[PDB]
Design a protein around this ligand. Structure first.
Ligand code: HEM
Length: 364
């Protein structure tokens, strides 16, 4: 099913590592070296596809990225660890007494949304409206592709335009009364306009909510499926940062990244024409035998672990430290609260560009 793409990746790495789809006119790249080159080579492969920095090339990207780095420094993450912990503990309290529960609905789905709202300075008396927007951001164009996509895109514009106005309001607020949130930090050289700041805030939801949820779900799944690891982590919570890196390698939430060739060039010995679209499967790269010893094994001690779950190069995930922090806290906290846990059932997300779970039911 959609939760089990790895055999197919393995077949492509072996049989068709650089492949052209004649219907969609797109290349797919599956080997670690090829994927990493495509993703990192800003000179040869463009990210230009209101999407903010993730779809900008230099020099525009350079200018904005350098300004927003200030919002994710180790100092800021340290500052927020307390609050992420409190949020995590509060979520857990709601299902602490149950013999069965859905890890997604009850825990991994709400957690990143609550965290980012507080990090974006969303006033607490406006939390539901914000959550509602975040839900709309990950709604499917369903169903399906029957030219009703025109509608979906309209409801997406609607949602985004409502987010824009909302962020506009918070931005003005933080100008008058700054606090310790990302918006305060970016409105305090290095001075973005609202036309750049607003699309950036929306990107944080788009780039960070569902991926972080899916990281947490996928990490717990990998942990449960691997004998002894749950108990080892419970006894030795200091192993968690490394376990998180292995979960990123093993079950990356964002399996595929797009680029456009800026010039005719070769990838893995295949000529990619200027203007051609390329899909770089970081999920496949992360399983590539040529780069990782025994890639099929989920080894929480794997070190070094040069996965590309967060990308590579100029667009390397801005939220990496926050995702790492959220996952460490979420996972350590979950495993501490529960002596034993077993997988009952999963329902996979059915979406090419996404790897994760719609539901993850576990029992004590
Ligand atoms: C496990 C969780 C996450 C994963 C796996 C992930 C993955 C990625 C990847 C692969 C890229 C590179 C895109 C490319 O090269 O085309 C990226 C970029 C980005 N991510 Fe993340 N992400 C995660 C969480 C987050 C969070 C929590 C945030 C913010 C709150 C965030 C914000 C961003 C932004 C703003 C970019 C664009 C950076 C740039 O273009 O310079 N991500 N992410």
């Amino acid at each position: 099913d959609a939760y089990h793409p790895f055999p197919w990746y393995e077949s492509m790495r072996k049989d068709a590592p650089v492949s052209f789809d004649e219907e969609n006119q797109v290349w797919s790249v599956f080997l670690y070296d090829d994927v990493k080159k495509v993703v990192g080579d800003k000179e040869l492969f463009s990210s230009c596809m209101g999407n903010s920095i993730i779809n900008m090339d230099p020099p525009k990207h350079t200018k904005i990225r350098s300004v927003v780095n200030k919002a994710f420094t180790p100092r800021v993450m340290k500052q927020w660890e307390p609050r992420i912990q409190e949020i995590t503990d509060e979520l857990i309290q709601k299902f602490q007494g149950r013999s069965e529960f859905d890890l997604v609905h009850d825990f991994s789905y709400p957690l990143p949304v609550i965290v980012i709202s507080e990090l974006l300075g969303v006033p607490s008396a406006h939390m539901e409206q914000f959550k509602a927007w975040s839900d709309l951001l990950v709604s499917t164009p369903k169903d399906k592709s029957e030219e009703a996509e025109k509608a979906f895109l309209e409801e997406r514009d609607k949602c985004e335009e409502e987010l824009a106005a909302f962020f506009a309001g918070i931005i003005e607020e933080k100008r008058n009364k700054p606090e310790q949130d990302i918006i305060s930090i970016l409105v305090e050289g290095e001075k973005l306009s609202g036309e750049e700041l607003i699309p950036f805030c929306t990107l944080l939801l788009v780039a960070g909510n569902e991926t972080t949820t899916n990281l947490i779900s996928n990490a717990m799944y990998s942990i449960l499926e691997t004998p002894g690891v749950y108990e080892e982590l419970r006894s030795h919570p200091e192993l968690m940062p490394q376990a998180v890196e292995e979960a990123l390698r093993f079950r990356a939430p964002a399996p595929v990244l797009r680029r456009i060739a800026k010039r005719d060039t070769e990838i893995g010995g295949h000529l990619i024409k200027e203007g051609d679209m390329v899909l770089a499967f970081v999920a496949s790269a992360n399983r590539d035998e040529a780069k990782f010893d025994r890639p099929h094994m989920f080894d929480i001690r794997r070190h070094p672990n040069p996965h590309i779950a967060f990308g590579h190069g100029i667009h390397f995930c801005l939220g990496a430290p926050l995702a790492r922090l959220e996952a460490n806290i979420a996972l350590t906290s979950l495993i501490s609260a529960f002596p034993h846990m077993e997988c009952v059932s999963i329902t996979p997300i059915e979406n090419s560009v996404i790897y994760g779970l719609k539901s993850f039911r576990v029992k004590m």
